[PDB]
Design a protein around this ligand. Structure first.
Ligand SMILES: *[C@@H]1O[C@H](CO)[C@@H](O[C@@H]2O[C@H](CO)[C@@H](O[C@@H]3O[C@H](CO[C@H]4O[C@H](CO)[C@@H](O)[C@H](O)[C@@H]4O)[C@@H](O)[C@H](O[C@H]4O[C@H](CO)[C@@H](O)[C@H](O)[C@@H]4O)[C@@H]3O)[C@H](O)[C@H]2NC(C)=O)[C@H](O)[C@H]1NC(C)=O
Ligand SMILES: *[C@@H]1O[C@H](CO)[C@@H](O[C@@H]2O[C@H](CO)[C@@H](O[C@@H]3O[C@H](CO[C@H]4O[C@H](CO)[C@@H](O)[C@H](O)[C@@H]4O)[C@@H](O)[C@H](O[C@H]4O[C@H](CO)[C@@H](O)[C@H](O)[C@@H]4O)[C@@H]3O)[C@H](O)[C@H]2NC(C)=O)[C@H](O)[C@H]1NC(C)=O
Ligand SMILES: *[C@@H]1O[C@H](CO)[C@@H](O[C@@H]2O[C@H](CO)[C@@H](O[C@@H]3O[C@H](CO[C@H]4O[C@H](CO)[C@@H](O)[C@H](O)[C@@H]4O)[C@@H](O)[C@H](O[C@H]4O[C@H](CO)[C@@H](O)[C@H](O)[C@@H]4O)[C@@H]3O)[C@H](O)[C@H]2NC(C)=O)[C@H](O)[C@H]1NC(C)=O
Ligand SMILES: *[C@@H]1O[C@H](CO)[C@@H](O[C@@H]2O[C@H](CO)[C@@H](O[C@@H]3O[C@H](CO)[C@@H](O)[C@H](O[C@H]4O[C@H](CO)[C@@H](O)[C@H](O)[C@@H]4O)[C@@H]3O)[C@H](O)[C@H]2NC(C)=O)[C@H](O)[C@H]1NC(C)=O
Lengths: 131, 98, 124, 107, 364, 123, 123, 364
């Protein structure tokens, strides 16, 4: 009864910034639904970039200083939109981006570890060929 | 989802059937998600709508799981895909009057 | 430290903060029928918990080595990483449920080694 | 990090079988904080069993597992047509979380 | 052995989630005033004269006002209490036994009624946690958390649209609803000032009403719409308690349509509003689906003193999104008011344990 | 006996209490007020017993828990330790001294048990 | 089981009781007379438990407390100690014999614990 | 040491015999029906809604219906209850204070009376054991034993010769008396079928009466006499309750001489027997030695519905040993009916202990 939608198709110049979205239908707020952002090399495995738990702009040490996460919180007329900012899009930044909406209110059944939560649902997947 | 036929000027009933035999906070709506009617657990709240004097719910079937809507003096304008908001598995009923 | 007065990454200082709290584990027609029965039920439940506490194989606090082997399937802890810091909730109930599974196994094994040696030793 | 390595990569089986799917990991994880992501052909990955072997009421009981130290053999019994896919044992324990190698179930 | 053996803790503030029934905590005034239902007085458990509370430091604990489970027992206690309690002369329960309308006839005596505060105590263990932050949007986190053994001085009132004699919000009002601006959910706001309503008809003040409309309109703009005008509309429509407002007025329930109150246009860029009320003798029952009948009042002009604290109302729902916002009175669900009293808590319990996997190796 | 002697202080009280402790066991209608007193008495007695249970001696009439009754407090000659003991005003001061060593003693054995419990590590 | 066997005496009762003890947990309106019975039952149970607490064994189904079940009482062959045990008239005599050694045993371990507790010196 | 030291058990089904007073277990219907003695209702302890019972396997446990000690408390509870209870207007106690006949005069109100079931619960410990075999001759062993915490659904009735509304025997009837065919003891038999007696005079059925005489006559032959004829004789003689039969008939006690019932000749090798009953106003007291006096009945023709279950009667005692057996009605002692209700039990208690003398040698 809950479906996640990410941004569309985006092609950026080498050495630029990106702003992809993560719409979350049937979701209330990022305060209850923290979103962990994970990238994916096209065709390859998915590497966890970072997260926006409790409206906290952060990423991994491999992604620190290049990736910060904002998640515009809206509910009702508009679903919660989790954004993603990745600076200096080189040709190596050609990747498929991914978001994940999972509840943070439930705190005694099995959903999360130090921010890295159980990825229940996913969006569509945004293939971005930086050219 | 259910498709129901009809004619102008007919006492039609649109059921709102849930899975569990309980009376919950339901909301009857038009295609524009405008509040036709609902309940405060034990009252009949005819929400802000154009069919205020037309639509009417049955009291005795709420505990029986049904939160219907009875429309008197049916019209072509009264024909809409009415949204049966119950248990988040909405049996949005369709009405055809032409 | 305090009754939920810290927030950090997990596993050790909780053993240390609970160590400090446990070091100071003591913090040192008319009038009444309904409250007394609640006090009686509370002491019955507490004492029933205490006798079940008494039939255990560790009897020690915050540093205990009861006999079940937290095997390599469960053991991944580096030597110095065992005692550093620990808060973390959904993770905690799973950690706490893991704490109890080792507890029942541990005390059953020390009860089993105490009983096994009891039958076999025989320590003159 | 802790490099997960799902074993094997490809395997052949019929419908209605019981096959264990290993998952290498330098660290073991108490209670299996590794979610298996069955990426079926034509569908995004999904949650099969939260907590390795805990009971989930959204996925049928055909999926079961077992843990052997560095390896985590998901013993899926009664394989079906939808079971022919690429699972993904992902540790959601360390920071960051890593995928395995992937296991393809075919005819 | 050289392997890891784990430790045993004791007296720990660790916890495990609990799913149970709490009990009422209201003094046994049972023996002196009277046992005629004055709001907890049939056989309720007294209140601990020393309410316990321990603040939780640096605990970013979240709270949802929809998944409390403490809420779950309050309405059961209240319905059972109204049943043992103040009785209508007419009881109606339509049931298919299409259905067969059943009827139960009993006596309906009327007494001066006033809500009494009901604390909520838990059994051995079952730690309750009090959210004490400022910005609490119902389904939100809480920086300032403080566990309690029993709840605070909650003064609930079974009522319509605006909550009577209850708790207060945080610094203006607080939009605590499930959804803030969805045209599908009920707006759940509580007041911050006790709005005194004098009913003899009710002499509703105008300066306090304009101030509460102004504080709520600014909070709605802060929640949604930077440069927007929010205008108030008249009643939505429906039953007696829907268009008008039921409230404890000396035991009775006057019914003033709150349509002459909500017509204020606020701009982002005065003696007494005597509304016409109604003498209550036969109304739809709020407990379940049916009707009631009571005894005539002992007063022709009924005097009462009541402070109303809460704001639950309906909305048009058009778009009309940020051009102008329009809201209508109504609401006040029995299920939702029930959720609205106990909105900052949860229950967890524990046994004195916890580990550290060490190589301490002690005998036994 | 239960206050059946009168002599100079310190030892036979350890001996008379030793004998008493050797035989420490001496082996509309009916009631509401007396039961609550029995309940409060057993609650107080059991609360005293659990506090008794969290101690570092767990033994009777002769015990050596770990606090050093230091030379500032120690003046007892070797054979003078166990001879005879009754004496009241002196006793509450003696008994209060008994308790100060008790809390210190049990805190020290709890401290050595805990300290060794962290350090030993006894395979 | 709870009286689910019938055989010759002495050992499997230690074993069947061992299994039962291994799983020793099996895991105007409403009331005045029943509460007093529950209070008296817990007072009696707790009084029994504190008397249980002042004992010298504190162990279950295999215990060596200090009284010598002397040769006047000892006739048990080594392997004959643990085989099977039901038998009633014989049982109260056996059970009363069980209790006489119990009181003696715990008195002796209390005596050795107290005696050592007077003499040791375990620093 | 190398010598034998014995073990300490815990949670054992060992037991020790107990000699004490058990308490009544009958629901406190005290508050709703009435406290006018209806058979346990002055201050009796309620019944545990979940009766506990654990079957004992392969336990050849014997039982004597004469040395119960559970029996010892029932008549004391019943006499104390009849005293607090339904009162005669005349009380007589002849005592040498040759003796001085004393008299106590009080009121005698009459109410509809019906026996209520009284379970018998024990204090902490005091395990009760239920015999559940088929062939139980009172003073006999029991292969099928099942311990209980409280007794079964015992419905006792203080009565004469045939026990009213009680328990049942095993597959025909059961000869449970002290002696089976001694001409010195009272025959203690209970029925197996509830013999419905309709009293308006009592319309005693004839087919059921012939069947109960046939089942009892075959059981008497199985107990004594292979090829023998057993004929029934009329009443033995004595007081009103001796020749006739007292029984709870809507509170009253009709008195029909059971002499027209016992004249059946059975061979080893039919609408209604309306017996003449009597309106009860003055009878000898059954509690102790004396007489009573009550209030007149509210009905001229008194209707009641009663099922009688039991067979206690006298005998000629001639020899006449196996040639023919002749038995006469009578009996129904207060002391013996008292023994007849609680006939399959005994009370034992225990502390969690037991030994095995071993050489385990554990420290402490
Ligand atoms: C606060 O308020 C918001 C709305 O204002 C509520 O959010 C809605 O939640 C419901 C479910 O709870 C959402 O419904 C789901 O929508 C998914 C997306 O479909 C939309 O978008 C596509 C693409 O544009 C359109 O074609 C389509 O018509 C919809 O407009 C669906 O995929 C979901 O369907 C799933 O379940 C059904 C069940 O039958 C299956 O048949 C489907 O195959 C699928 O599995 C579902 O219908 C709705 O979209 C949400 N709206 C918004 C705006 O977010 C919140 O729930 C509310 N807060 C709370 C706590 O209730
Ligand atoms: C609180 O809530 C209630 C219900 O929502 C509001 O009631 C509405 O009040 C308006 C007036 O503001 C009503 O409009 C009036 O309708 C009258 C017709 O009543 C007759 O007909 C009905 C059937 O339709 C019968 O049931 C009834 O018994 C009567 O027989 C008109 O007579 C009124 O007109 C009067 O004023 C105009 C002013 O120009 C004059 O020209 C007329 O001559 C006449 O004097 C008026 O039109 C409306 O019907 C009510 N019900 C609704 C909307 O459902 C309360 O007003 C509200 N309280 C407030 C706003 O303070
Ligand atoms: C239930 O139990 C009682 C007591 O045991 C039985 O009572 C006996 O009944 C028999 C009849 O079956 C009685 O015998 C009758 O005696 C009468 C004499 O009564 C007078 O004398 C006595 C003193 O002896 C006075 O007290 C009394 O008031 C009377 O003044 C006779 O008159 C009877 O004879 C009648 O029948 C014969 C039949 O041939 C006629 O010829 C006569 O003319 C006359 O009509 C009869 O003999 C006996 O006395 C009673 N008491 C005993 C034995 O102690 C019940 O019968 C019994 N119920 C049964 C069997 O159903
Ligand atoms: C319900 O209430 C909770 C708390 O009561 C509330 O969560 C809070 O949300 C605000 C923002 O909505 C958070 O404030 C953030 O603080 C960080 C730290 O300084 C800032 O970096 C954030 O800025 C980010 O977001 C901007 C928005 O566009 C981005 O443009 C920018 O790039 C930044 O990345 C922001 O100011 C606050 O931390 C939380 N509090 C907690 C405890 O989580 C929640 O939003 C409320 N929900 C609703 C529906 O009202």
């Amino acid at each position: 009864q809950i479906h996640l939608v990410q941004s569309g198709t985006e092609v950026k110049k080498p050495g630029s910034s990106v702003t992809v979205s993560c719409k979350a239908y049937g979701v209330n707020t990022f305060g209850l639904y923290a979103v962990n952002w994970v990238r994916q090399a096209p065709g390859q495995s998915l590497e966890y970039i970072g997260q926006i738990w409790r409206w906290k702009s952060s990423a991994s040490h491999h992604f620190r200083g290049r990736v910060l996460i904002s998640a515009v919180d809206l509910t009702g007329s508009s679903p919660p939109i989790s954004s993603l900012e990745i600076k200096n899009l080189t040709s190596d930044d050609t990747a498929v981006y991914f978001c994940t909406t999972t509840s943070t209110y439930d705190k005694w059944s099995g959903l999360h570890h130090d921010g890295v939560m159980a990825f229940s649902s996913w969006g569509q997947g945004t293939l971005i060929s930086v050219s | 989802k259910k498709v129901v036929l009809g004619k102008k000027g007919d006492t039609v009933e649109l059921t709102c059937t849930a899975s569990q035999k309980k009376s919950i906070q339901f909301h009857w709506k038009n295609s524009n998600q405008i509040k036709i009617l609902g309940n405060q657990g034990s009252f009949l709240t005819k929400g802000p709508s154009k069919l205020n004097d037309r639509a009417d719910s049955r009291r005795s079937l709420w505990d029986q799981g049904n939160f219907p809507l009875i429309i008197k003096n049916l019209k072509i304008e009264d024909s809409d895909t009415y949204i049966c908001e119950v248990e988040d598995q909405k049996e949005e009923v369709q009405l055809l009057v032409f | 430290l305090g009754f939920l007065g810290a927030a950090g990454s997990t596993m050790g200082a909780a053993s240390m903060t609970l160590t400090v709290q446990a070091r100071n584990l003591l913090s040192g027609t008319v009038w009444g029928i309904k409250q007394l029965q609640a006090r009686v039920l509370a002491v019955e439940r507490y004492l029933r918990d205490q006798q079940l506490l008494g039939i255990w194989g560790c009897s020690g606090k915050l540093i205990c080595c009861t006999n079940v082997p937290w095997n390599s399937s469960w053991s991944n802890r580096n030597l110095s990483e065992i005692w550093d810091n620990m808060t973390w909730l959904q993770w905690d109930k799973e950690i706490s449920n893991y704490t109890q599974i080792i507890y029942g196994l541990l005390e059953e094994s020390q009860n089993q080694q105490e009983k096994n040696e009891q039958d076999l030793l025989a320590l003159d | 990090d802790i490099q997960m390595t799902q074993s094997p990569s490809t395997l052949s089986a019929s419908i209605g079988d019981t096959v264990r799917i290993s998952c290498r990991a330098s660290q073991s994880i108490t209670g299996n904080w590794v979610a298996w992501y069955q990426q079926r052909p034509g569908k995004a990955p999904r949650l099969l069993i939260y907590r390795g072997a805990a009971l989930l009421g959204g996925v049928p009981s055909r999926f079961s597992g077992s843990a052997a130290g560095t390896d985590f053999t998901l013993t899926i019994g009664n394989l079906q047509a939808e079971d022919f896919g690429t699972f993904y044992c992902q540790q959601y324990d360390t920071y960051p979380g890593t995928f395995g190698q992937g296991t393809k179930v075919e005819v | 052995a050289e392997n890891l053996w784990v430790t045993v803790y004791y007296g720990v503030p660790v916890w495990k989630d609990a799913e149970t029934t709490l009990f009422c905590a209201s003094d046994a005034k049972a023996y002196e005033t009277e046992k005629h239902n004055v709001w907890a007085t049939h056989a309720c458990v007294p209140t601990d004269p020393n309410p316990q509370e321990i603040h939780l430091e640096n605990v970013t604990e979240e709270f949802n006002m929809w998944k409390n489970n403490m809420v779950e027992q309050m309405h059961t206690d209240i319905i059972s209490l109204w049943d043992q309690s103040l009785k209508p002369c007419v009881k109606l329960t339509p049931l298919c036994v299409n259905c067969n309308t059943s009827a139960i006839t009993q006596a309906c005596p009327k007494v001066s009624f006033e809500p009494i505060p009901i604390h909520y105590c838990a059994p051995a263990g079952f730690a309750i946690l009090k959210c004490k932050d400022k910005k609490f949007n119902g389904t939100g986190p809480c920086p300032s958390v403080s566990t309690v053994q029993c709840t605070h001085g909650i003064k609930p009132v079974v009522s319509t649209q605006l909550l009577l004699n209850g708790s207060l919000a945080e610094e203006e009002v607080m939009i605590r609803s499930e959804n803030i601006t969805n045209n599908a959910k009920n707006i759940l706001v509580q007041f911050n000032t006790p709005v005194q309503i004098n009913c003899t008809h009710c002499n509703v003040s105008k300066a306090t009403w304009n101030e509460t409309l102004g504080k709520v309109v600014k909070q709605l703009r802060k929640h949604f719409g930077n440069n927007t005008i929010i205008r108030f509309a008249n009643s939505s429509g429906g039953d007696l308690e829907v268009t008008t407002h039921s409230f404890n007025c000396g035991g009775e329930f006057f019914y003033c349509n709150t349509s002459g109150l909500f017509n204020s246009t606020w701009i982002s860029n005065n003696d007494s509003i005597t509304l016409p009320c109604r003498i209550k003798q036969i109304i739809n029952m709020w407990q379940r689906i049916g009707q009631a009948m009571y005894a005539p009042p002992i007063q022709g002009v009924i005097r009462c003193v009541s402070n109303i604290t809460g704001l639950i109302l309906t909305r048009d729902g058009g778009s009309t999104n940020s051009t102008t916002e329009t809201f209508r009175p109504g609401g006040g669900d029995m299920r939702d008011n029930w959720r609205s009293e106990l909105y900052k808590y949860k229950v967890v319990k524990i046994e004195p344990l916890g580990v550290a996997p060490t190589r301490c190796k002690r005998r036994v």
